Design a protein around this ligand. Structure first.
Ligand SMILES: CCCCCCCC/C=C\CCCCCCCC(=O)O[C@@H](COC(=O)CCCCCCCCCCCCCCC)COP(=O)([O-])OCC[N+](C)(C)C
Ligand SMILES: CCCCCCCC/C=C\CCCCCCCC(=O)O[C@@H](COC(=O)CCCCCCCCCCCCCCC)COP(=O)([O-])OCC[N+](C)(C)C
Ligand SMILES: CCCCCCCC/C=C\CCCCCCCC(=O)O[C@@H](COC(=O)CCCCCCCCCCCCCCC)COP(=O)([O-])OCC[N+](C)(C)C
Ligand SMILES: CCCCCCCCCCCCCCCCCCCC(=O)O[C@H](COC(=O)CCCCCCCCCCCCCC)COP(=O)(O)OCCN
Ligand SMILES: CCCCCCCCCCCCCCCCCCCC(=O)O[C@H](COC(=O)CCCCCCCCCCCCCC)COP(=O)(O)OCCN
Ligand SMILES: CCCCCCCCCCCCCCCCCCCC(=O)O[C@H](COC(=O)CCCCCCCCCCCCCC)COP(=O)(O)OCCN
Ligand SMILES: CCCCCCCCCCCCCCCCCCCC(=O)O[C@H](COC(=O)CCCCCCCCCCCCCC)COP(=O)(O)OCCN
Ligand SMILES: CCCCCCCCCCCCCCCCCCCC(=O)O[C@H](COC(=O)CCCCCCCCCCCCCC)COP(=O)(O)OCCN
Ligand SMILES: CCCCCCCCCCCCCCCCCCCC(=O)O[C@H](COC(=O)CCCCCCCCCCCCCC)COP(=O)(O)OCCN
Ligand SMILES: CCCCCCCCCCCCCCCCCCCC(=O)O[C@H](COC(=O)CCCCCCCCCCCCCC)COP(=O)(O)OCCN
Ligand SMILES: Nc1ncnc2c1ncn2[C@@H]1O[C@H](COP(=O)(O)OP(=O)(O)OP(=O)(O)O)[C@@H](O)[C@H]1O
Ligand SMILES: Nc1ncnc2c1ncn2[C@@H]1O[C@H](COP(=O)(O)OP(=O)(O)OP(=O)(O)O)[C@@H](O)[C@H]1O
Ligand SMILES: Nc1ncnc2c1ncn2[C@@H]1O[C@H](COP(=O)(O)OP(=O)(O)OP(=O)(O)O)[C@@H](O)[C@H]1O
Ligand SMILES: Nc1ncnc2c1ncn2[C@@H]1O[C@H](COP(=O)(O)OP(=O)(O)OP(=O)(O)O)[C@@H](O)[C@H]1O
Ligand SMILES: [K+]
Ligand SMILES: [K+]
Lengths: 11, 345, 335, 335, 334
């Protein structure tokens, strides 16, 4: 029950 | 509101995800023979396999513990032990069938001690009661068989662990345009798995309801179409994503279609590609469907590869991004059936 | 009534002899291969019999060994004096009869090892029997585990599940004679890169005075790119254009009945669930090809989801078809 | 200062760099996939680490189970041998120290079971933890055994060893140009169903707006049956003539010194012993494309039997060649 | 003497990979060769490994029951002089080497009778116990894996494909040919088989560059030009000689002083195992009978087709023209 959103992070 | 009525019905043959949504019926189901269940044991998941594994071992132990309890009961042994006449008076001379089996708890401990080859020595079988030896033989045969079967289950769940899932990716939408002077159909294919895909091949087919001069009609008719390769072969290399274009020549069954008539057109494009993965050894096959409603005319794909410092870069965010460059209209047959000028394109 | 023998029976399993073959003898490799490829009803028998024979044989040897050293003839005399039998160093403590030796074996091989029947360092023969017993037990256990796992591994595949039409139909299509049969499916996972081939088999001569008993003349299944590869998820009709180049040119319905001929259909592909290659075949004879009985449409189109049929799988409806040859078809090709 | 980006380094290994990826995660099923495939150095550690861990952990569990029932008090404090008679209330007979619990856990899990530390029927928690320890031991044992067999299955395959020559050539064969490299093989088993494909990688704009950045055309390899197969035991020379259809047709003797060409070659096939597909790839930038140089004869028939002399695998010798273009050479006779 | 052939009449490509670079036999190769052995060695290595491990650890246990003072206690002290070994030895009831060997067997094979019990008195014994236990398990796993790998190769037995020692150059429907006969012994049917025909000869290109050996290809005659084939009975492969084939200018009556070789390669997959496989053979000039054509085999007897290998590869002489196909074509009719 969580969004568990996926966003990559920049070097 | 009104759109939903048109919307409820939808003539589709394979799911955009990739499954082949269909329906078999009127089959001659003669039966379902037994061994099938055993195969289901092999192809379960870890939680179910662990449960069935441990439950099977515990069930075997409890069952044969009940059996040993009955055996050490009928031989007039539990009473002979319970007679507290002395510290040890009648439990030595009377030759109890199984040494030191006093209660069901003890009998269960003995079952454990004899099935997993533990052998704690305190409670050994004797040479008096043949029934006990018969039950011991049966115990050991079933124990070894169960051990072998469970080991086979766990191993085969290990040997089918190289696979994860399909990793070939198609574009959300199609594209039609003009390239090298003539109309072209496009579609995008990309891969994610680091391991390459050797001996790959693609096929594009048109699925339609057809007609014949003699009269026969095939509801779901399939016909192949070329894949426009410079050497006319279905070999495609997959390092970067690309566009597997198909020139719509006159011989193709899409000569007559027009850009305006697309919304109602009953034809559906199917793409089926396949190949063997290098690091596992399995031949995989991925299929996608291009419905008439999803073919945005006129569009074209953008570049997705740029020279970085010394090494090419590739994007996947702009993967499906398309530019609506103005395109010739309804020229699939009009331009093909070239006018006197033949320069309308 | 006469047989007029075929090449492939309607189910497959090419029924041809093989005579005057030099023997290669055999190998124990064959006995092992026969063991591996058995079915359960015999595996769960050969395995158990192997175990029981092992135990009984080693128990007999143990009993003989405990006899020679006089162990039996020594425990017997120890009536009430435990010292009078404890004094003499026995070879395997507390074995005094067969049943005892049997239990000692069954405690040694399966490694149960209770220990109330202990083994001491007093008789080298006992050490050699122990070594031999344990090694035999490990080898038998390993090979039986191998067999059981091999069954648990290769019981993922079953008999080939493909359905062909009972009869073949010579019909009319696109203004020309044509050949049709039906090829279906029952399993779930679609075969991968399927291919189909058609071979007309008939005894042929060669104008330079040489005969050949059973020729095989491959012929191309029709397709717009001449590709044997065929998608197969719903029942299909693998067609066959008839041409002045194809060996069906000179056959009419009149000459159809008492004509020597055959058709072999072989299709091959790799199932992905089991990841294994497979090929299935059929074979039609002359009398089994109902001329002009065009194949009947099968699949229907419901609103939400399509549907198919198998009850009327090989129904051969009839439509008008010319009763004439193919050479004569273009000899007077007007109408 | 860097040179033009190369699509495929000499050791295959396409060095593209995919970014902007929808990173799923790991699913915790990745760990087992990694564990099944490790260099043998580790799988003789994770074995030892797993066994020794499980042993120590269950040893501490036995220690606390015995400790909280008051057994250790009865053993340590009460009379050693004579002054004390056991009340039979103990939970695990004769385990009066931690090391004793270690030598009990080893027994209870490696199935040794010496029998000096029995399991009595008093303490139910003891039987529960015995069931749990035995189950865990079997599960770990099966997993490790399957891992060891899997890493004994992959003892045949080592590495792809198919050797392409360093730099290609361009020469004259049958009054027409060509373009040749040299494939080869090392180990004993031949290749089966071997295939070769040549792709040229280029940045080719189109007269209709589209500009594909890195686009790969395919070009045929010379063969008298138009079949991309090849059967090699000694090194071959897979030529590929140039013609109006070919893209190199506009190459030039001087322009190639500064030109954007990329001729990758890929070769696929299986090996008889392994029965596993495989492929090998390489690329030829313009800098390592010679001109006029032709390859050297390598096979010399010795007194006894043929010899392939690897001493000069990639040596090249100069030979007559024109400096004009392909279209220049084929433009006109006098040209 | 004998002029060398590229590949002999029964597989086994003979060559000389002279002056190959030195890879270096990497240590994994020992295990690699352990996995694939015949069975007259597997049981030997199995038994030797087990016995050697047993003996080695038995010697170790004896040394442990020597450096610690136990053997002296059991030997010198009588039954009741000490009246029980109060100072518990590292391992109970170990007073020999044979006794130590029995104890080692007990600990290794997971028997543990109980007489040779172990106490927690001294640590070094416990460390040796753990060491031997883990090594024993590893050896157990290795040998089980070996035996099961061998079990998994029961089906993979050998190669059987019946070629012929005689190629026939005989007329057929107004042309020449180079036929041969292909058989099959195994009851299986080879799925997706293919045939290939190659020609080897020394060559000199017009620009003066020579190739000593060389594989030209020749098409296989088939009314759809498909290299697939279906070998149930013996079949007669043929390769018609068009004007453009390499054999178009053969020395019809002089197939003696000719530098030639023909290679046949057959590829397939067996529909019982799934293992790919490939057979091959070669015809030198001297083993190519001329004019002789192959013999019909199948003769229907009682409604079941018959195939006899008695006359598998013997050819009947039949008169035929004696001139190159160029000489049999340039003229209007020969
Ligand atoms: C249905 C099948 C049962 C098969 C086993 C027989 C079980 C009872 C046999 C028996 O009583 O022992 C007999 C062995 O008897 C033999 O030696 C039989 C030899 C057959 C071996 C192979 C059979 C297959 C003899 O026993 P004993 O050792 O002579 O005991 C006398 C010594 N005591 C008086 C001290 C006790
Ligand atoms: C290195 C010299 C001997 C080497 C033998 C190996 C065992 C060493 C540990 C040890 O000495 O046990 C000790 C505890 O020890 C602990 O409490 C360890 C803590 C739990 C272990 C967790 C993993 C580390 C002894 O603990 P005990 O048995 O409870 O002491 C009472 C027993 N007695 C009365 C006879 C003394
Ligand atoms: C396969 C079949 C096994 C057949 C067993 C019969 C041999 C029995 C030998 C025996 O009794 O022990 C002997 C050893 O004897 C040796 O030392 C053997 C040689 C050692 C070889 C070790 C590997 C090389 C006695 O050795 P001990 O330890 O010097 O003496 C012990 C007696 N004491 C306790 C009174 C001091
Ligand atoms: C000996 C065989 C003689 C002929 C028997 C024919 C009728 C019995 C069916 C055959 C059989 O194997 O019996 C099994 C009984 O089920 C079971 O065995 C279930 C367990 C019952 C206790 C054992 C059914 O199983 P199946 O083998 O038919 O299923 C896989 C398809 N062959
Ligand atoms: C003593 C012999 C054993 C007891 C008598 C058995 C007679 C009836 C056979 C019952 C039986 O075990 O079924 C066989 C296999 O077991 C199974 O299919 C189920 C095994 C695991 C159950 C979960 C059928 O044999 P099958 O159909 O599996 O043959 C492989 C398909 N190729
Ligand atoms: C496999 C076992 C599964 C569970 C079996 C439960 C039944 C236990 C068998 C006991 C039994 O049959 O009674 C014996 C007599 O029966 C018999 O004589 C026939 C034995 C039938 C066994 C089933 C009595 O034994 P007894 O008369 O010797 O006891 C008096 C000497 N003091
Ligand atoms: C944790 C898991 C194990 C826990 C200990 C076992 C639970 C105790 C079971 C009940 C019980 O002791 O009764 C015994 C039979 O039980 C039964 O009724 C057997 C039920 C089997 C179905 C499962 C006979 O007890 P007894 O008559 O031998 O005791 C007097 C002799 N002196
Ligand atoms: C003996 C140990 C008792 C237990 C044996 C378990 C059964 C193992 C099968 C034995 C076996 O098939 O050996 C055959 C003959 O071996 C032989 O050379 C005969 C020696 C007998 C022991 C093996 C195979 O030998 P092969 O001809 O297949 O070897 C060429 C590679 N397959
Ligand atoms: C020794 C080296 C061991 C390395 C770790 C191996 C873990 C294997 C886990 C396999 C797996 O995916 O099953 C998971 C359970 O994890 C587990 O149960 C882990 C147990 C590992 C014991 C070894 C989740 O299972 P799931 O999420 O797919 O099932 C949900 C249906 N309700
Ligand atoms: C311990 C019990 C040994 C039982 C037999 C095991 C044989 C199989 C071991 C595999 C092997 O060859 O050892 C290699 C090196 O060993 C070593 O380097 C041993 C290190 C200690 C030497 C003293 C590791 O295999 P690898 O990592 O080199 O191979 C992978 C790259 N292809
Ligand atoms: N950056 C990416 N990384 C991995 N997969 C991608 C990425 N972009 C798109 N895909 C895959 O491509 C398919 C279609 O992508 P599309 O070109 O439609 O981008 P999108 O519109 O963002 O997709 P969606 O609407 O599913 O988010 C999807 O199934 C998706 O899994
Ligand atoms: N409803 C069905 N479901 C699955 N398979 C079928 C079904 N009907 C037939 N088959 C298979 O397809 C083959 C051809 O069946 P077809 O439809 O021709 O019936 P038929 O052979 O004309 O009838 P009969 O079996 O009485 O001769 C049969 O061998 C059968 O095994
Ligand atoms: N004896 C040999 N064994 C294996 N490979 C060789 C051998 N000789 C040359 N090669 C191959 O030649 C390629 C390049 O060789 P390298 O550049 O080291 O020597 P070179 O003489 O400068 O180049 P080349 O050998 O190609 O002429 C390598 O890929 C190597 O595999
Ligand atoms: N009855 C048979 N059984 C097995 N193989 C046979 C049989 N007859 C012939 N062959 C195979 O045919 C091949 C050659 O047959 P051919 O007609 O040339 O007879 P051949 O060469 O004289 O026989 P051989 O080589 O035994 O002297 C041989 O390799 C042989 O293995
Ligand atoms: K496997
Ligand atoms: K054990």
């Amino acid at each position: 029950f969580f969004m568990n959103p996926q966003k990559v992070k920049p070097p | 509101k009104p759109r939903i009525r048109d919307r409820l019905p939808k003539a589709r043959f394979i799911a955009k995800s990739g499954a082949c949504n269909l329906a078999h019926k009127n089959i001659r189901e003669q039966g379902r023979f037994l061994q099938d269940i055993f195969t289901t044991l092999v192809d379960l998941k870890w939680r179910h396999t662990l449960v069935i594994f441990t439950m099977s071992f515990l069930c075997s132990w409890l069952l044969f513990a009940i059996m040993w309890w009955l055996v050490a009961f009928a031989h007039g042994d539990i009473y002979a032990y319970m007679e507290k006449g002395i510290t040890e008076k009648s439990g030595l001379e009377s030759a109890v069938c199984v040494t030191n089996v006093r209660s069901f708890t003890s009998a269960f401990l003995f079952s454990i001690e004899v099935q997993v080859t533990i052998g704690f020595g305190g409670r050994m079988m004797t040479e008096e009661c043949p029934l006990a030896i018969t039950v011991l033989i049966l115990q050991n045969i079933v124990g070894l068989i169960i051990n072998a079967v469970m080991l086979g289950c766990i191993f085969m769940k290990t040997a089918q662990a190289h696979r994860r899932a399909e990793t070939l990716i198609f574009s959300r939408h199609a594209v039609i345009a003009v390239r090298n002077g003539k109309l072209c159909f496009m579609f995008r294919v990309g891969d994610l798995r680091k391991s390459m895909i050797i001996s790959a091949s693609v096929r594009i087919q048109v699925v339609k309801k057809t007609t014949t001069p003699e009269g026969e009609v095939v509801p779901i008719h399939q016909q192949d179409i070329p894949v426009d390769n410079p050497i006319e072969s279905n070999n495609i290399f997959l390092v970067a994503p690309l566009i597997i274009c198909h020139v719509i020549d006159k011989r193709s069954p899409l000569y007559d279609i027009s850009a305006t008539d697309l919304v109602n057109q009953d034809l559906e494009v199917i793409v089926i590609l396949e190949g063997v993965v290098e690091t596992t050894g399995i031949t995989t096959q991925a299929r996608t469907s291009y419905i008439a409603e999803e073919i945005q005319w006129g569009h074209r794909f953008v570049s997705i590869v740029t020279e970085e410092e010394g090494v090419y870069s590739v994007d996947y965010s702009k993967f499906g991004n398309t530019v609506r460059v103005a395109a010739p209209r309804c020229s699939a047959r009009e331009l093909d059936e070239k006018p006197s000028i033949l320069i309308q394109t």
